[PDB]
Amino acid sequence: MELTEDLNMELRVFFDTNKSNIKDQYKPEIAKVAEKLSEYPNATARIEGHTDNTGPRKLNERLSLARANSVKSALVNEYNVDASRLSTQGFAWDQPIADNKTKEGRAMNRRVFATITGSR
Amino acid sequence: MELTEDLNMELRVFFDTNKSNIKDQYKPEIAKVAEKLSEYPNATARIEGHTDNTGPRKLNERLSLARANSVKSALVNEYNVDASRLSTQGFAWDQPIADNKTKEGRAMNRRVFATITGSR
Numbered sequence: 752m753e754l755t756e757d758l759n760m761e762l763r764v765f766f767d768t769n770k771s772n773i774k775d776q777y778k779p780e781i782a783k784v785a786e787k788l789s790e791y792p793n794a795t796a797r798i799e800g801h802t803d804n805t806g807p808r809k810l811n812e813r814l815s816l817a818r819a820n821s822v823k824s825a826l827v828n829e830y831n832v833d834a835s836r837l838s839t840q841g842f843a844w845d846q847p848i849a850d851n852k853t854k855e856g857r858a859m860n861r862r863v864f865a866t867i868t869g870s871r
Numbered sequence: 872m873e874l875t876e877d878l879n880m881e882l883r884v885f886f887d888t889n890k891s892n893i894k895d896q897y898k899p900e901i902a903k904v905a906e907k908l909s910e911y912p913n914a915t916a917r918i919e920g921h922t923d924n925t926g927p928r929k930l931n932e933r934l935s936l937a938r939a940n941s942v943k944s945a946l947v948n949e950y951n952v953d954a955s956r957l958s959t960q961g962f963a964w965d966q967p968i969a970d971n972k973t974k975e976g977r978a979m980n981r982r983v984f985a986t987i988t989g990s991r
Contacts, residue, residue: 752900753881754907761873780872787874 758791760784760867764822765858769806771817773825781822784867785830794869796837798822801864803857804844815841818863877990878911880904884942886981889926891937893945901942904987905950914989916957918942921984923977924964935961938983 762784764777773781788794800819802811819839826832850856882904884897893901908914920938922931939959946952970976 752903753879754903755879757877757879759875759877763872783872783874 756791756871758787758794758867758869758871760787760865762796762822762863762865762867764818764863764865766818766861766863768803768857768861769810769814771814771821773821778825781825782830784865785826785832787867787869788826788830788832788836791869791871793871794836794867796826796865796867798837798839798863798865799846800839800841801846801848801860801862802841802844803860804847804851805857808843811843812841815843817841818861819865822863822865875990876911878907878914878988880907880987882916882942882983882985882987884938884983884985885978886938886983888923888977888981889930889934891920891934891941893941898945901945902950904985905946905952907987908946908950908952908956911989911991913991914956914987916946916985916987918957918959918983918985919966920959920961921966921968921980921982922961922964923980924967924971925977928963931963932961935963937961938981942983942985 762780798819800815802815819841823837823839826837827834847860849859882900918939920935922935939961943957943959946957947954967980969979
C-alpha cells in the first residue's frame, strides 16, 4: 500500500525588548514541536529570528539570531533533539510582520517563527 | 502554533470475473484504511470501480459501481465508517490500466482504486 503522512507545523515565539529568553508560556508549544520531531524522525525545522527596528543594527543582527538559537537550544538541550536537524538564522529588523510605530506592532516583530516539515 | 498532518493513501482491490466480492486477500488493506480513517476523522475516500471489456456493456456499468460499493460497504458495515465520507463511482471498461487481450491484463482491469485524503 501507498500510504504517507506529511507534517507541517509553524511555531511562533515572542520576546520582550532586548530579550532572547523563552518565556514559560511558550514551553508547551516547544514540547509539541519536540513530540512531532520524534513522531516524524526525518523532519527538520527552519527557525528564523527577528527584531523590531529599535536599537543598533549590530545588536539586532545578534539578537535575531540569539532568539532563533534560544528556540534551537530548548529543543536540543531539554528535548534531546539532534541539532543538525534545526537550522537557525536571524533577519534583524529586515522582515517586519507588523507596524514598528506602535508598541503592539513592535511586540509582534520581536519573534521567532519556526517551520517544521517532515513525512513518514 | 499551527500543526497539520496530511494523509494520502491509495488502496487497490482486484476482483474475479463477474464478481464484486472482496477477496480475503484484500481485507488487511481495507482494515488499514479504516484505521487511518479513524486516525484522520476528517479524511474522505474517493472509491472508483472498473471492469475488463468482456461482456455486455450494462453488466459492466452495474458491476463496476458494485465493486466500488462493495469496498464502501466493507468500510461502512465492518468498520463503522460514516458512509457520507466515502464516494463511489463505476467506470465500466472505460479506464483500463492494462491490456484486455490477456487474462493477466483483464485481471488488472477488474479493480477498485480508492484515494483517501485529508488532514488532522
